[PDB]
Amino acid sequence: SKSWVGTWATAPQLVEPRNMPPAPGLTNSTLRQVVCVSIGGKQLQFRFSNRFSKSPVTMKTVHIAVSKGGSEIEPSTSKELTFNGQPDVTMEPGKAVISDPISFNLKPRMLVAITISFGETSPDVTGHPGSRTTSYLLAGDQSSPDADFSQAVKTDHWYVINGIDLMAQKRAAAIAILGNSITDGRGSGTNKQDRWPDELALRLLKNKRTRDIGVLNMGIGGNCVLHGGLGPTALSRFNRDILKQHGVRWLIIFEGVNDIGGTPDKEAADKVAQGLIAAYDKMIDEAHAKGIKVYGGTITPIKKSFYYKDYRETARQTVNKWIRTSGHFDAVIDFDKAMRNPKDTLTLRPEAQSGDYLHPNELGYRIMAGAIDLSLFKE
Numbered sequence: 001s002k003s004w005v006g007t008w009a010t011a012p013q014l015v016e017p018r019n020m021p022p023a024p025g026l027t028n029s030t031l032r033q034v035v036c037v038s039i040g041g042k043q044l045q046f047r048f049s050n051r052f053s054k055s056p057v058t059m060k061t062v063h064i065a066v067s068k069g070g071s072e073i074e075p076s077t078s079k080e081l082t083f084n085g086q087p088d089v090t091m092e093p094g095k096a097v098i099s100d101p102i103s104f105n106l107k108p109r110m111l112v113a114i115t116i117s118f119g120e121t122s123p124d125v126t127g128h129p130g131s132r133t134t135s136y137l138l139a140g141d142q143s144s145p146d147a148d149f150s151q152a153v154k155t156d157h158w159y160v161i162n163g164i165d166l167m168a169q170k171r172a173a174a175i176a177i178l179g180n181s182i183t184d185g186r187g188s189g190t191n192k193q194d195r196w197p198d199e200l201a202l203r204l205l206k207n208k209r210t211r212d213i214g215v216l217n218m219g220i221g222g223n224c225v226l227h228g229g230l231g232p233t234a235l236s237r238f239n240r241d242i243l244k245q246h247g248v249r250w251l252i253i254f255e256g257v258n259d260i261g262g263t264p265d266k267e268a269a270d271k272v273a274q275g276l277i278a279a280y281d282k283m284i285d286e287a288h289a290k291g292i293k294v295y296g297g298t299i300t301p302i303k304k305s306f307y308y309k310d311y312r313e314t315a316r317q318t319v320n321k322w323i324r325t326s327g328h329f330d331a332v333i334d335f336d337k338a339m340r341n342p343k344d345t346l347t348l349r350p351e352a353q354s355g356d357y358l359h360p361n362e363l364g365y366r367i368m369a370g371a372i373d374l375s376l377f378k379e
C-alpha cells in the first residue's frame, strides 16, 4: 500500500567551467552537501546522477545525517548508504544510481547533510550550479561522522546529488515544478532555503489537507524552454526531470523568459512566443497522458531589466494571454499579477526584487508562493 514519493530533487546539467568545484576538486575528496526536504517519512532512497558525464564516477562512501547548520551535523544521526549492499558504487557514463532503501527519521523541512567520499570522478561534472546552498569540500576520505568540516573549502553549488524519495501511502503525492532562475532561486537567500517552491512547501505543510504533498523544484538557472540557455532545455529534460519523478500528480510550468530575452528582433520574438505556446501544449499533453494535472505560471515582468525591449514585451504579452485564456492549462497561477507593480504593471514591484528588475528577492518569492491557491492540490 506504500510507494515512492519524491520529497526533494534538483535538476542536473553539465557543470560549466566557471561553476566547477574549487581545489582540491572532487577526485579523491569528500564533499558535504545540504538539502531541505518537503514531506517527511521513514524509509528513503537517494538518487545520484552521472547523466552529463562522459567518464564513470566512483563514490567510495555516502553518509546521511541531520544538518545542524553550516557544515555541522548531528553525529548520532549519521548512517551509511549502500548500493546492492556495498558502500561503494561506480556510476556509468550518462547514467544514474539509486541507493538501497534506508530507514531515517526524516521530518518535514529537515535539513539533510549528504557526505560523499569520491574516488575517480569525471572532469565533465553532472551537477546543479544554482544550489543557493553552500557545500563543503575536503581533500581525502573524511567520511567519519566526527570529521571536522569547519575549515572545508566552500562552494555554492551542488554536484552529483539528484533526489530523495520516501515510501508513503496513497494520500501522499508531489508537485513537480519546471522553471528557470526565478524558480531555481536567484535572489533567494543562500542557505535560507527560501526559493518560491520552498515557500509553497511551507504553506502546504501548514495546511492540514495538503500536509502529505511534497515539492520537487526542477528549476535550472538560466534555462530555456526551446533552445539555448543554460543546462538542457525544458523540452529536452521534461521526461527525466518531470515524468520520471515518483508520485507526481501536478506539474507547474513557469518558464520562457530566457527564450524571449534571447531574441534580436520582433520577428524572432514573435516566433519564440508561438514556439513557447506549442511547447506548453506538448508538455501539457505528455503530462496528461500520465495522469498529471498541469498549471501554467504567467511570465513575470521584465521592464527595467537588461532583457527589456519593446518587441520582447510584446512576445511576453502574447504568451501570457494564451496562458490566461486558451484553457489548455488545467489552471493558471498568475505570478505576473502577483509580482507586477500596481502603479506600473509592466515592471516588478520595486521592494520585491533583487535590483535587476528580473529576479525577485525573498519577499517576492514569499508573495509568489502566497498567490497559489492550495485547493489546486487535492488528493
Ligand SMILES: CO[C@H]1[C@H](O)[C@@H](O)[C@@H](O[C@@H]2[C@@H](O)[C@H](O)CO[C@H]2O)O[C@@H]1C(=O)O
Binding pocket: 019, 129, 130, 131, 180, 181, 182, 184, 185, 186, 220, 221, 222, 230, 258
Ligand atoms: C545557476 O545559474 C546561474 C548561472 O550559473 C549564472 O551564470 C547566471 O546566469 C544568468 C541567469 O540568472 C539569468 O536568469 C539568465 O542570464 C544568465 O546570465 O545566474 C544563474 C542563477 O540563476 O544564479
